[model samples]
Target: HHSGLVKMSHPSGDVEACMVQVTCGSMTLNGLWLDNTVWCPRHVMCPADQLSDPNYDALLISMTNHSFSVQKHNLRVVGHAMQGTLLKLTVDVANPSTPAYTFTTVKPGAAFSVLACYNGRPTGTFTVVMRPNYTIKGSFLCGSCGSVGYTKEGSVINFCYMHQMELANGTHTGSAFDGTMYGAFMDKQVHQVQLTDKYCSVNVVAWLYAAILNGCAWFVKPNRTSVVSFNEWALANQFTEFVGTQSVDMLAVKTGVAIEQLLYAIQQLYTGFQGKQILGSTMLEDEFTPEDVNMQIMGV
Candidate 1:
């Protein structure tokens, strides 16, 4: 038995259907093949109404050869290896070139009908988000603007404040979080972060979680803990405290995770401690202009 796509041409112009008759016993021809309209899987009479339809594919039937004739005239009757395991018929349904069905099992000599329906092209849009949105509360801190806490709605994120922030929503950016912009200038205090790196935000989540959990300066012993497991513990705890309704950390602690695990997670979260740029830049005086940039920045 064999199964796959089969193409055939006819001397009688268009081959419409497979009409076979045996003089002695009978055999079953099965499986789906298509050129246009899907063919009826089992060997049977093609509907009179459908026979004339030019939308039909010519019947190119193959099987275990046994023997027969033109049962009549245009209808030829021959016995062949028409029975094989129908591994499956791949159909183009919703999306173009996407497999919609898989037929795995078919016993020898068994015949049944198969049909596939293509409902045109799939409608609507599909989107891929590189970094998913996570809820967080942030406060913008700068001596110039004064400190202001913020919250965002929907699936948008709460940024840690950055220069890109001003470009993101401008003056209305602060208002979106129900805070005053206080103008964009700040002498010795520029607050913002690079959010393009997904890990950066995840790290912040880990940091906040570690602070809420063990509360500051957590560390790990050599090889005693897995950095990944610890980070998860931190992320979950923080998520519960801020986003979820339940409490964690101590609850997670009883799960038998090592202290090293907790320590390592927070350690990774704060690994970039010496990077002053993380605390954000400040408007400073240089030898070239001493307070020129700072004077206008302070806006005094």
Candidate 2:
């Protein structure tokens, strides 16, 4: 018989991100069955279950549960790339409806980026585990980046995520020197992640959007260290994981303006960096009593 390994790729120029669940006759790939007699969806193209041969029993699967509801996705810049090498996620809807569906789940995961080298792939897929019928609504905001601002390999978080502790304790000041942005500057991995006003969430569809268009790699432990060592199979493995963990969810959401308005006010009315850099401004807002960065997003 011919080789059974599936070939996972678009026709060179066509690349995209999608979700699919499959069940086959007797074969197994990742503990899931994929032999003969499968019900994979032929109506859509999903990144996870994109089979090489139509004869391969498979069923394309997407349901109301396949949408994103998780919150908070981290974006770390790695490898040698430019400043605008964006890391973001967007929605993907196969069957369009008059009224769109929303992704409203908390606690998904994080993402990262690179170019030429890791190519800005997420460590895992942006996912949300929640009940059905939840409309996702929120905006993206960053209270602080790191001690400095931007780095290669990993993003050094200088403050507690979203200044949760500081705001709760009422000890926020308007400077990175306030120690609000104080935290371990080491490269730490993850067990789980979530999004909150204090934190943020990741949009799977949004993330998948970036992955398909940007042509980046998702972050994985095995593929962690060096990007150059990744072969075709290695990369394929990464993509498999990426699709398996993520889903497509549509929503009526956008980055909020409260953050920008606050920044503008601070720069124009206040006497700090004044558009130069707010540096721990989020914390300072607590003291000065400014509106919060009501929006926080995953990839954008």
Candidate 3:
């Protein structure tokens, strides 16, 4: 048995769907493409009307030489793998409702599917196995108005804050802020809001500090204790340049996650730092200057 990634695009070169291709029993299944209609053979047991339903966007069929019984399990496994990959693809695609961030390299777990989704390119699958606790990590940069963040190794990430203004204007340029550290801070904010609506009303910077302190209480480890101290140092050293003026007991009320696990995510983002070495510098003055050249080079 063999499987790979396949991309289907519209006539005008716009992408329509990215899918997995599986071959077993000398029969090849390219996802959701039955005579150009979105139908899956897996719905074989369904009524004929439901079988041709355009809402269905997956394929599961079995055919082989000899008895067709030997590779049944293989085909089933492929189906399950596609299910997981397609699920994650849908989630990440939904993460950023707008084109807020430039695309990053694919993470390990869903690399094939992600790559296909990102570039409208074809690749291979089936050799890769998806883990139950798979999470994505990479830098998400805003090319226009300088709202940037790196996604942590967490399942529930908020891509809404990674907003870029240039995509709206059809132009882009680099941002002066240190997106690396800000990215971690944003990740902390996401986890906090995920846990409680109480953090929502507060100013972003103040909310971040509150979440950090709340995280210290939940974990109480020496390292997290240092993060508390880091917050104090931030306040004292004018790292508060970005600070705004933001709650905990109520944070624990009616939340989807337990207190312990919620703070665990907070601590995870706090410690999982990445970016340039300039921790103190929030804005680069040199980046504000405009470039002199306005030439438009032709394509190769």
Candidate 4:
């Protein structure tokens, strides 16, 4: 899967910084930004100008709960990926010397990349736990690559996972890969998925609308690191083949699709329709077998 939306917050009221910014290696993906100083429509894509600065509203994000009712998801973190890579969470105050915000419940986690070289193939995944200073090992199996390619039995080393942040859980999801852009995103393996901002709520439909509700729900990642949810696939591939709009309605409240459907959709996003890179000549198989990845998943 590529892009995605999480309606954790209610759209019933006004939201600020509804949109967010996703940063990978050295690029920018898409997201929603919340701004309460001004009013905007709900579910609309936020303008670029509003999210220009990479480091935005850290102070506001830190104070989200104090500003609004806990029921209102006032801000959100709309994440985006440049390619398929492990992600780690990090919270850096622009000025370390500055006094830190003190609120125990608003902690976000970190993500890291896992390109294992234990033998061959990229076997790995990541897990998030609410603890501090714990040693984090990656998914034992291979990774499901994004637009970027998952290494075969040749170059990938280590696992794709974010290090555990000394944090308290709220909500988080594994992002989809960028399907065919593999060649461009794998060289740098040992890194963290740095989070730029932490808003009160996210605009699941668009980056423009938001509120400060805090009922956070995270989607479990696919068995494969490279896989993504159907909604993720649509956002990553720009709704190609109208998968979100055609096959199944992601925006609608319908329930019939299986979890496999979301995984298959994520894999299918780059396999054929995009004419980018194919996981295989025909059927793309996972590099690492289930035995390998299951260990890390359950261990978490």
TM-score per candidate, in order?
Answer: 0.17, 0.13, 0.17, 0.16
Task: Write model 4 residue lDDT over 31-131, tens digit each, in one string.
Answer: 21222211111111213433323222232333222222111112222221122222211222121122111112111222222222221122232232211
Query: What does candidate 2's lDDT look like per residue over 139-221, in tens digits?
Result: 11222111011111122211111111122222211112222212221111112222222211122223222222333222111
Candidates ranked by lDDT, best first?
Answer: 1, 4, 3, 2
- Please write out the lDDT profile of model 1 over residues 1-300, one tens digit for every residue: 121111111121111121111221232222122221122222222233333331212222432222322121122222222211111122232222211232222111111121111111111111111111221112222111111111122322121111102322222112111111213221111343323212322223323333333323223324443445545654644311112112223323423334455445444534444433311212110111101111222221
Q: Locate the minimum summed-lDDT window of 10 residues in model 3.
A: 289-298
Candidate 3 collision pairs: 149-183
lDDT of residue 290 for candidate 2: 8
Clashes of each: 12, 36, 1, 66
